[PDB]
């Protein structure tokens, strides 16, 4: 839960999962970028955020 993560300030679990490439679901109202570029998908820019 992104709200709970923001409120606690403890980023140990999220950091450990992002470093170790552990699959996860970040849940919360999020803004998103609509990318219509196929090259962006090939470049894998969605994983760089």
């Amino acid at each position: 839960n992104l709200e709970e993560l923001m409120r606690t300030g403890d980023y140990a679990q999220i950091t450990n999962m992002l470093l170790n490439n552990q699959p996860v679901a970040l849940v919360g109202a999020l803004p998103f970028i609509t990318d219509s570029s196929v090259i962006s998908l090939v470049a894998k820019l969605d994983a760089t955020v």
């Binding site: 606690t8 403890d10 140990a12 679990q13 450990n16 999962m17 170790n20 552990q22 699959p23």
Partner: protein
């Protein structure tokens, strides 16, 4: 093993200390250890079972960390923690059961189950913390080749054996001289019998000797000596050595004479007790040598003199007993004893899931066969399963 023990002890401390209304300062360190365990275990896949009727179980860890409270834990915190604790306890119990039912002639001390082998990887060493129980302490000492010590109340060191030796005998079994003993558990009950009451023996003394070879060295042992052997003080019909015939025993009990208990280590006399009954201390030994005597009473009342004629037939047979009871001791090896449940737990787990007999332990984990042939490989495997059983007892 140390990682599995640390998981189990973390879960035990979580169950005991994470209780509603407790100060967060009472659990801060425990909560940190628990969250470290959650971090290290999350994203790892474990499998248990697949042996006997132990079901195949798959374990996944995708838990969130335990939070914090300003002053005191509330009910919500306890339920949220208890869900995770229950899952982890189930996983640890299953891993322990998987490890208890396996054995290896080679490297019996090493983990045998896949889950425990995975837990021995470097990534899980983070979970390791206080190793304070007796069995885990001895496990670490044995890993370091340091001196191990297990304290047993009434150690199960003597394999069951009810036997006799006839030093003098003949097919009619009416003039017999010999010894009959029961070595069972932590008890020796020996009795030397002479049917003639040492009428023709030199100095009217008959010397009886019993030697018990303990399969492991016992140290700091408290032992009770009692003059009489109640188990061999009543009449009984006893099979022949080959079972071809039965003979008759009709004891009349006389005080054992010149009683001498020798506790020996590697053939060297360590402790000697002469005509001493009650509590004695054997500091370090692997052999017990009980030498006693039947001394014909020089003076007899008419009733006594009647029982012991100058010649046959002998209807009342003189018997001198001796009872030895190891109440407590210390052994460098693991043994079954009256106060613990390790052997019972391992046997129960093996029987419940119908584990087929392996190449290390005797069928059904029978203790008499196991302690009769207590090999170093058997010792390693038994220490492993006993340590896992103690780890499991923390939770189950």
């Amino acid at each position: 093993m140390d990682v599995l023990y640390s998981l189990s002890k973390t879960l035990k401390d979580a169950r005991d200390k994470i209780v509603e209304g407790t100060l967060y300062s009472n659990v801060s360190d425990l909560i940190q250890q628990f969250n470290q365990m959650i971090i290290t275990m999350n994203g790892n896949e474990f499998q248990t079972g697949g042996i006997g009727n132990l079901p195949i179980r798959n374990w996944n860890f995708d838990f969130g960390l335990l939070g914090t409270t300003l002053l005191n834990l509330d009910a919500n915190y306890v339920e949220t923690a208890r869900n995770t604790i229950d899952y982890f306890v189930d996983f640890v119990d299953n891993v322990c059961m998987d490890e208890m039912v396996r054995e290896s002639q080679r490297n019996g001390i090493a983990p045998q189950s896949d889950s425990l082998r995975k837990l021995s990887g470097i990534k899980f060493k983070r979970i390791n913390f206080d190793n304070s129980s007796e069995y885990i302490e001895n496990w670490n000492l044995q890993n370091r080749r340091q001196r191990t010590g297990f304290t047993f109340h009434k150690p199960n060191i003597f394999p069951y054996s009810a036997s006799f030796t006839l030093n003098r005998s003949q097919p009619a079994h009416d003039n017999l001289m010999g010894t009959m003993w029961l070595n069972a558990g932590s008890e020796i009950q020996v009795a030397g019998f002479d049917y003639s009451c040492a009428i023709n023996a030199p100095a009217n003394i008959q010397q009886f000797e019993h030697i018990v070879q303990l399969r492991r060295v016992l140290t700091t042992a408290t032992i009770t000596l009692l003059p009489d052997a109640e188990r061999f003080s009543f009449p009984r019909v006893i099979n022949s050595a080959d079972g071809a015939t039965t003979w008759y025993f009709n004891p009349v009990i006389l005080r054992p004479n010149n009683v001498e208990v020798e506790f020996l280590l590697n053939g060297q006399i360590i402790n000697t007790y002469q005509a001493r009954f009650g509590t004695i201390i054997a500091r370090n030994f692997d052999t017990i040598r009980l030498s006693f005597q039947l001394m014909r009473p020089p003076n007899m009342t008419p009733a006594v003199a009647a029982l012991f004629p100058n010649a046959q037939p002998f209807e009342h047979h003189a018997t001198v007993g001796l009872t030895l009871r190891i109440e407590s001791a210390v052994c460098e090896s693991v043994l079954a004893d009256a106060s613990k449940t390790m052997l019972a737990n391992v046997t129960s787990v093996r029987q419940e899931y119908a584990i087929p007999v392996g190449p290390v332990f005797p069928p059904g984990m029978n203790w008499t066969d196991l302690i009769t042939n207590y090999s170093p490989s058997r010792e390693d495997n038994l220490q492993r399963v006993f340590t896992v059983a103690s780890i499991r007892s923390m939770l189950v």
